[PDB]
Structures are given as structure tokens and as C-alpha cells.
Amino acid sequence: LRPKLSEEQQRIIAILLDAHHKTYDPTYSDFCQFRPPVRVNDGGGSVTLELSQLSMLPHLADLVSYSIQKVIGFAKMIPGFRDLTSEDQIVLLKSSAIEVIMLRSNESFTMDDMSWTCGNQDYKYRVSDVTKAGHSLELIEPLIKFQVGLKKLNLHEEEHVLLMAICIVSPDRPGVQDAALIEAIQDRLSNTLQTYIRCRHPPPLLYAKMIQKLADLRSLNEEHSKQYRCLSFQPECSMKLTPLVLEVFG
Ligand SMILES: CCC(CC)(c1ccc(C#CC(O)(C(F)(F)F)C(F)(F)F)c(C)c1)c1ccc(OC[C@@H](O)CCC(=O)O)c(C)c1
């Protein structure tokens, strides 16, 4: 059966598309405002050298910090998100931050050369840039696999925005107080997505594949958190970060 999207479900999609258009700049025009990228000679991928220099850390921390601000803006526009307590909204934003960043980064990701192409050569990011910021192969390898897997689903913008919204409004995050209300908001979004796929996505199992991506995001989040913790042990690391990044990941 293919039930049609309700007036409410069509309204939810319009709100989320509008929210994304207002919080995502596909021209990457603010990137010149970040601390500049610096790429040291590191053909060997030396952990000692990367930790001593952390050459890409100020630029990558400014990029993630900027993206978190956009994610906070997007979340405020999710139907029902404002119905949650400020404590729950913050727990949800903090626990989902890195996952939503990985999802939204997919728009700039290109399978042409396996990079995140955000304008000129200075804003073209590869595996080596993330290692130059103190991260390791245990994070970057599955991150690239995830980006390809997601790119290959060829999501409609409607599906991409619904997926980010479902990711954020997750009742299974440590520290949430009103899990039942969060689940009700997520179910309203999940039902919109399942209905949309059946009614608007042409052939040639997409909903199941999108849910699997949300599970992959949990493992990437756990690895990112372990690696951030290591990176934070580097003397003088905090100046290379931002207050928002320090709060979200600290
Ligand atoms: C996910 C892939 C990548 C690859 C370079 C990325 C970057 C930085 C980090 C980090 C880190 C930190 O641990 C911390 F703490 F910051 F998390 C560190 F800094 F400490 F190292 C990681 C793990 C991955 C990336 C590429 C394009 C991006 O935005 C493109 C547009 O999406 C922007 C516009 C928008 O989003 O509106 C974004 C956001 C991120």
C-alpha cells in the first residue's frame, strides 16, 4: 500500500527543506573566515609529527564549530523540537553533533576523487587532512566508507533533511529525560520519510538502508569521541579548538 502524504507530512517536508536552505550554504562562502588550513609534509602519516604540529586542527575545528552552529539553527526548525525542554534539546544537539556533521558533509563529498570539495584547492579535504588534525585511520577509513555508502543512496533533498532530523531527535541518547516525547517527534518524522519513499522515490529497501546509516553513525560517533579524548591530551590543544567544540566534545 502507498498512502499519500498527509497535509501535515507535506508541511513537515516544506519546513525541513526551508530549514536546510536557510542553514546550509552550498557555495562555502564563509570558509575564508576560518583560521587558514596549513598542510605540513607528512607522506608517512606519522602520528608523532601530526600530534606535534596539528597543522589542520585550527581550520577543521573552525569548520566543525561553524557546522554545529548551522545544525543548532536547523534543529530549532524541526517540527516539535521546540516542544522539548531546553535540557533535552541540548542533550540531543550535543550527542548528535558529529553524526549530523558527517551526514551534512555528504553534500560536498565527491566520489570523483573521494574528497569533500568546498571550493578552491585550499578547501578541498582528504583523508590526509583529518590525520593532520590528530585523528587516526580507525576513524577516517570507516568515515570514507560511510560517505560513499551514503552518496550511493542518491537521496532526494527531502530524504536527506528528514534523515538529519531523525538523527537529531533520537530517544536513545544518554541523559534524555522525556524519551517518550522525543520518540513521538521522531516517529512523526520517520512516518513522513517512509511515506515519502513509497510515494515519491522511483524504482530501483531504501528506508532500511537509511536506518542502517543511522546505526553506522553511532559507531563513527563512538570512534570520534575516543579519538577526540586522545587529541585533547595534547598540550596546548584547547587554543586550536573553539569554545563550542570544547563544550560539545569535552
Ligand atoms: C565529516 C568530514 C570532515 C572532513 C574534513 C571532518 C572535519 C573535521 C573533523 C573533526 C574534528 C574534531 O575532532 C572536532 F572536535 F572538531 F570535531 C577536531 F577538530 F578536534 F579535530 C572530522 C572528524 C571530519 C568535514 C568535511 C566537511 C564539513 O563541512 C562541509 C559543509 O557541510 C559545511 C557547511 C555546513 O555544514 O553548514 C565538515 C563539517 C566536516
Curated annotation (Swiss-Prot):
Complexes and interactors: Homodimer in the absence of bound vitamin D3. Heterodimer with RXRA after vitamin D3 binding. Interacts with MED1, NCOA1, NCOA2, NCOA3 and NCOA6 coactivators, leading to a strong increase of transcription of target genes. Interacts with the corepressor NCOR1. Interacts with SNW1. Interacts with IRX4, the interaction does not affect its transactivation activity. Interacts with CRY1. Interacts with CRY2 in a ligand-dependent manner.
Name of the featured protein: Vitamin D3 receptor
Alphabetized UniProt keyword annotations: Cytoplasm, Disease variant, DNA-binding, Metal-binding, Nucleus, Receptor, Transcription, Transcription regulation, Ubl conjugation, Zinc, Zinc-finger
Mutagenesis or variant effect for residue 135 to Q: In VDDR2A; loss of calcitriol receptor activity; no effect on interaction with RXRA; changed interaction with NCOR1; loss of interaction with NCOA1; no effect on sequence-specific DNA-binding
Keyword Zinc (UniProt): yes
Biological processes, Gene Ontology terms: apoptotic process involved in mammary gland involution; calcium ion transport; cell differentiation; cell morphogenesis; decidualization; intestinal absorption; intracellular calcium ion homeostasis; intracellular receptor signaling pathway
Function recorded in the entry: Nuclear receptor for calcitriol, the active form of vitamin D3 which mediates the action of this vitamin on cells. Enters the nucleus upon vitamin D3 binding where it forms heterodimers with the retinoid X receptor/RXR. The VDR-RXR heterodimers bind to specific response elements on DNA and activate the transcription of vitamin D3-responsive target genes. Plays a central role in calcium homeostasis. Also functions as a receptor for the secondary bile acid lithocholic acid (LCA) and its metabolites.
Highest taxon listed in the record's lineage: Eukaryota
Domain notes: Composed of three domains: a modulating N-terminal domain, a DNA-binding domain and a C-terminal ligand-binding domain. The 9aaTAD motif is a transactivation domain present in a large number of yeast and animal transcription factors.
Cell membrane found in the keyword field: no
Binding site for calcitriol: 24, 67, 104, 108, 135, 224
Family the entry assigns: Belongs to the nuclear hormone receptor family. NR1 subfamily.
UniProt modification remark: Ubiquitinated by UBR5, leading to its degradation: UBR5 specifically recognizes and binds ligand-bound VDR when it is not associated with coactivators (NCOAs). In presence of NCOAs, the UBR5-degron is not accessible, preventing its ubiquitination and degradation.
GO function terms (MF aspect): bile acid nuclear receptor activity; calcitriol binding; DNA binding; DNA-binding transcription factor activity, RNA polymerase II-specific; lithocholic acid binding; nuclear receptor activity; nuclear retinoid X receptor binding; nuclear steroid receptor activity
NR LBD domain sequence ranges: 8-250
Region feature (Interaction with coactivator LXXLL motif): 76-94
GO CC annotation terms, alphabetical: chromatin; cytosol; nucleoplasm; nucleus; receptor complex; RNA polymerase II transcription regulator complex
Taxonomic placement: Eukaryota, Metazoa, Chordata, Craniata, Vertebrata
Disease: Rickets vitamin D-dependent 2A: A disorder of vitamin D metabolism resulting in severe rickets, hypocalcemia and secondary hyperparathyroidism. Most patients have total alopecia in addition to rickets.
Location in or out of the cell: Nucleus; Cytoplasm
Effect of residue 176 to M: In VDDR2A; decreased calcitriol receptor activity; decreased affinity for calcitriol; decreased ligand-independent localization to the nucleus; loss of interaction with RXRA; decreased interaction with NCOR1; decreased interaction with NCOA1; decreased sequence-specific DNA-binding
Motif 9aaTAD: where in chain: 243-250
